């Protein structure tokens, strides 16, 4: 139905079914958030799972229930002011990995960065900020252009989520791993290599280059 | 392939997460399709028969739904499950987090079995491991009931008593310091990964809520608040 | 007839070819298991090590033919191609003799899959040699690791001074590292006119070539993004 | 192979006019605008160039029987500009082309000067260097093209002596337009010349050429080729 | 004149590698030599074999025992590469001239057997005999049952004792539990041991045991072997007091 | 559930399959160069000739696997198919045993490319057998000539008596002539309800089936005209 990591817009169009008619679906999103019954932007507020126009409503409740549960049992000394920032981070974490085993590790990388004052420098934020201007490839001019969601230029979390996060992604966002790693790069054989200093990261990226050549 | 992912027409062997080696032994002894070559070995003689350099076999065979040729020898299957489990354990050890209190990967497997038997929700795996990991670093005894059951062994009739908790076995983490001598169950790859990637927290206590989860805490007064609360809730049902 | 076919594909090793003839019923094994020095002496080839000296192509031979005839003919075809290309070669090339050209042809072969880019790759390496820079080409490191190569290279691998490691050695490796094609040899002898000394895959089938490390690093980042989307 | 059956094969080195005549004499292709003057044809096809030469890619094309000419040619033009844009984007530095059109012109010259792929880069080099040194390209296909209709399959000494806009013995630099339809390999070669000092070359008679940087070696080679070509026939 | 000049060669450094030694002993002895420059001695063994150009994965048995002479200040890589070349020269010479119907797949198996034979005897006169016993055993499917192999397999786990429990534990090198040759050599064999591995003696003997007075007794049936073992037990037991 | 991709195509010969196994790095060779009698002895197959006994399909076998497992499994798969089809066969068929059905299946397989027509071809041959007519099928003549087949057939080839020549012998050939698919086996055992005893290729895909010689000859004339028209250059 709605798979973790998908866009809100992705769910909005999938408006193209017999069972759901276009009642409030083509309304502007701000006025639509007013109409649906409390966030200004709709991204991240609907729970991905394998489950009338109103049903979105059930998913929202299912999503907020999940977040509330996760926020209630959350870990101490987290750099989140409120549950919304945790949801933003959960979205960031979700699209940065496909393996559950690494969720906490990814979360750690970003959580620690926030506490250390570092920019998150995660590509999905910029891809999201450009949206329809994304041509399947990222260049230096893309990363240097200040967007509201550009985590290479801004400090801290972006204003909103960038995708629909899962319950596992929320819990991971609220339970980072105990490590010093603040970098990670795909291994090329499935997964990521996490590191704590830039030189180790560049070694890992070079390893990723070699495996990717070998995979050719 | 996507069915190689779920490890012709053949026999379907299943190893369930949290299960003991011995249960697997009985399940193969109760399968026609596997030939009984070595199922009644003493554990020392069986570890020698399979080539496994460990003295005791617990925890060394990976839970998963596998397919084996109808008629396969038992040793074939046991060796392959051993190789798969050690593949997972070596992989997890290679990418482990720093400053872990494990002398070697065997201790990681031990704790992975403990964590596996102590938790029901994957979301809490890292947390449970953390509580135990921190305890090991802080010198606290693990005080986990599944270890006590394992230590009682044949003397376990599906229920434990206060005398059971006070009775010194080699596996009783209320009486011994540190990890027990061997694993106490067959851990999943997720439990091994959790054992090697504890969460960033101060909690060193936890107790079940009753709906599959637990309340985690960092101080004994808060732990005791939560436990008396759970005792009250669980008694009523 | 349906006479025996021995297929030699470009980029394969001599060892692969030796095993391929040793696993053929139709080919007689007279000298196939000899050490390389004695084997080259047995065939009359004046080189000490056999890599790169046998031309890749699809050959047909009579069932029961000798290994020595087959290898002599492959050596003669490769040397025909090499002498021809060397005779018409470009000026000012940094090769002492045709053997060094063959080494470079093997490197180029294993470093590229599109014909259109062969000369450019050759240029990159030719220039590096004229500039005194190390070639820093991974296929040589793979060859140096040999049987210990499992499809991945580690930092300890790149630092290991093997005889073929172009990150640690200066110049060309001691021998070729594969069986090069004719076009790869021609490219070795006709580098392109450019200042580029770096290249990295684009992700869309080709490579991006550059002359400075900053541009190369931008290109590598672009490749990382492209591979991420797919 | 390029598919959309009718097999329109356009071989590299052919002229645009040849392609137009080969399509007007094809039963399977509908003839709508092939007999219009070329300026009107370029306006009708949407192409922004004044002259059509070199802008339609040689290849083995398979269309639907009964296809319109405009589709066939628009597809060929778009394919050529795809190749040309890609090649210009990845081109070598310090090239003497002001824009991609000059590169395509040069690709046509190179294509008409060689039959072996092995030599394309070398041919391009010889000419590219010449452009940089101010030397005239002195390539005969250009003069043939400049004579145009007055070319009956034979060239005379005064033909080479007569100044046409396409005569590279009399003009300095490149001719005003391409002289043939260049292949993808020829465009790439034009944009990636070889590193050599050679500025002369002459055919061997077996399909290849001898390249050199000095006139005397060139002259030895030219006489040898002259002898072989006379003695053969 | 210069015939005896060649004790071995490469005022002068005098490296000496003894028969029966392990690779590891040689590397440590090169690290504790002032005159040998340590450029690559501290590498892992796989990467070290690759650094030297050696195509074998494991370094054991590939460096020839002899008393050599190198320039004072010589690099380790020169030393090890030349010792490797000398060992492979000996091995190729012996493999090319080897006896027929031998149970070796390749020269590496011969080198493994040479290492075993080297560790199993100290008298050159008996080399051929020992190799014979092991060679014949391979043809008959019998396990070599040689203690130096199990010692090598136990590695650090060896305190000077071989017990029935030690002999019963499966190692990759345990010739009581595996059939055929171990995965790698277990020591550095000498030229004589390589040749002996490739030139077994003509007999039916498939058993042997130390005599106790220097040498071994070889036998063709187990009863003779057990009588000989009893004789060796008595001889050494008396030497205990 | 498509049974390293080892693919055996319908209508291919056994000899082709052996060569494709012998031309594989991924499959190790133990008995591929044995004579066919001795190799059938090796695999345990009780038939004297190996043709027709191995099922075409896309397999994706495990690399570095013995040929004997692969071929015994293919033999068993096709013999399972054949027994299944024989058990459910149509009544009054002129086959003495399942081997004749397999032979006919091979003939049918090599005689048609459209699945829709299998039964029809099958019918034509079955009826012919009941009426004593010769099958007069060219793939049988090709197989009978064997190594002597140069891609072309002469009238003397069709007139030369081979053991497999269905222009000269009555009934089925001694063995199959290719490896038939299961669809072909079933069609061989389920002929169509018709009186047609002739068929000829159309040249535009398919065949024209008829019940009388004059209609068949008309169809043959049309096919000859069409096929001559298609091949010009």
Automatic annotation (TrEMBL), chain A:
EC numbers for this chain: 4.2.2.29
Keyword Transmembrane: yes
Superkingdom: Bacteria
Keywords from the named record: Cell inner membrane, Cell membrane, Cell wall biogenesis/degradation, Lyase, Membrane, Transmembrane, Transmembrane helix
Predominant subcellular localization, coarse grouping: membrane
Part of the intact protein present: 132 to 356 of 356
Location of the protein in the cell: Cell inner membrane
Record's catalysed reaction(s): a peptidoglycan chain = a peptidoglycan chain with N-acetyl-1,6-anhydromuramyl-[peptide] at the reducing end + a peptidoglycan chain with N-acetylglucosamine at the non-reducing end
Similarity field: Belongs to the transglycosylase MltG family.
Tagged with keyword Cell inner membrane: yes
GO CC, one annotated term: plasma membrane
Record-given protein name: Endolytic murein transglycosylase
Membrane topology, record value: Single-pass membrane protein
Site entry (Important for catalytic activity), positions: 96
GO biological process: cell wall organization; peptidoglycan biosynthetic process
Coiled-coil regions, chain positions: none
MF terms (GO), sorted A to Z: lytic endotransglycosylase activity
Function: Functions as a peptidoglycan terminase that cleaves nascent peptidoglycan strands endolytically to terminate their elongation.
This protein's encoding gene: mltG
């Amino acid at each position: 139905l709605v798979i973790e990591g998908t866009t809100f817009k992705q769910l909005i169009t999938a408006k193209n079914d017999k069972n759901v008619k276009n009642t409030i679906l083509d309304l502007p999103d701000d006025q639509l958030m007013k109409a649906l019954g409390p966030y200004h932007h709709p991204e991240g507020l609907f729970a991905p799972n394998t489950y009338t126009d109103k049903k979105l409503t059930d998913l929202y409740h299912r999503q907020m229930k999940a977040l509330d549960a996760a926020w209630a049992k959350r870990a101490p000394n987290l750099p989140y002011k409120d549950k919304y920032e945790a949801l933003i981070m959960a979205s960031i974490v979700e699209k940065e990995t496909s393996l559950d085993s690494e969720l906490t590790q990814v979360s750690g990388v970003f959580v620690r960065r926030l506490k250390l004052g570092m920019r998150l420098q995660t590509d999905p934020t910029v891809i999201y900020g450009m949206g329809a201007n994304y041509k399947g490839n990222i260049t230096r001019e893309d990363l240097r252009t200040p967007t509201p969601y550009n985590t290479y230029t801004i400090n801290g979390l972006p204003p909103t989520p960038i995708a629909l996060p899962s319950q596992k992604a929320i819990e991971a966002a609220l339970h980072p791993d105990d490590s010093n790693n603040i970098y990670f790069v795909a291994t090329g054989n499935g997964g990521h290599k996490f590191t704590a200093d830039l030189q180790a990261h560049n070694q890992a990226v070079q390893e990723y280059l070699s495996v990717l050549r070998s995979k050719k």
